[PDB]
């Protein structure tokens, strides 16, 4: 029944909790710094939520934005060697969503793809949305639907748990044109 201030009180939290509860809150706390939501381990930026979009605009100029709830994410050059990243932004319902495609090295020459959407917003806000990722090919279709992650949470855990759209190179070839992959992204509200 002794109460401790949140470690992010200096940033404005005002929550005080029993030690039993302290870390569980501090992991979820809105006043926790946001890390750069871009894929890969190159950018080490951190800041508040309101600083994220300007950051992305200053430091990640190549990232393109599309307005609309229903768009096509065309990842080019998917067979180009290494582990690689694709990222773009989708604007709708008064929010920005980051679309990420990530290629990883798996067991042998075989590689795996992970595709996922994050909300540029809080976890609570993230709960109001759903997204759908669609791969389309000749007489085929692969679909993944879920709740977007808040960038507060990030995608490392989701991707690690296959909690996103997961497919490997052979799957990729079925849906690819040239060396490019079209991903249909549809956002909706719950």
């Amino acid at each position: 029944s002794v109460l401790f201030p949140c470690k992010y009180a200096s940033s404005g939290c005002e929550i005080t909790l029993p030690h039993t509860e302290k870390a569980d809150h501090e992991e979820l706390c809105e006043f926790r710094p946001y890390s750069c939501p871009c894929p890969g381990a190159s950018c080490k930026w951190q800041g508040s939520l309101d600083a994220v979009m300007p950051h992305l605009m200053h430091q990640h100029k190549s990232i393109t934005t599309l307005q609309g709830e229903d768009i096509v994410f065309l990842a080019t050059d998917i067979n180009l060697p290494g582990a690689v990243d694709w990222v773009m932004m989708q604007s709708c319902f008064g929010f920005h969503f980051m679309l990420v495609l990530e290629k990883q090295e798996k067991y042998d020459g075989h590689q795996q793809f992970f595709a996922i959407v994050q909300l540029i917003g809080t976890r609570k806000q993230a709960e109001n949305f759903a997204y759908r990722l669609e791969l389309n090919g000749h007489r085929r279709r692969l679909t993944w639907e879920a709740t977007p992650r808040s960038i507060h949470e990030g995608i490392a855990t989701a991707i690690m748990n296959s909690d996103c759209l997961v497919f490997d190179t052979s799957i990729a070839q079925l849906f690819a044109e040239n060396g490019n992959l079209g991903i249909n992204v549809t956002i909706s509200m719950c």
Binding site: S62, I71, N180
Partner: peptide, 10 residues
């Protein structure tokens, strides 16, 4: 419902 060519991060 448009499309966007996205190149690898680099």
């Amino acid at each position: 419902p448009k499309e966007v060519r996205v190149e690898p991060q680099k």
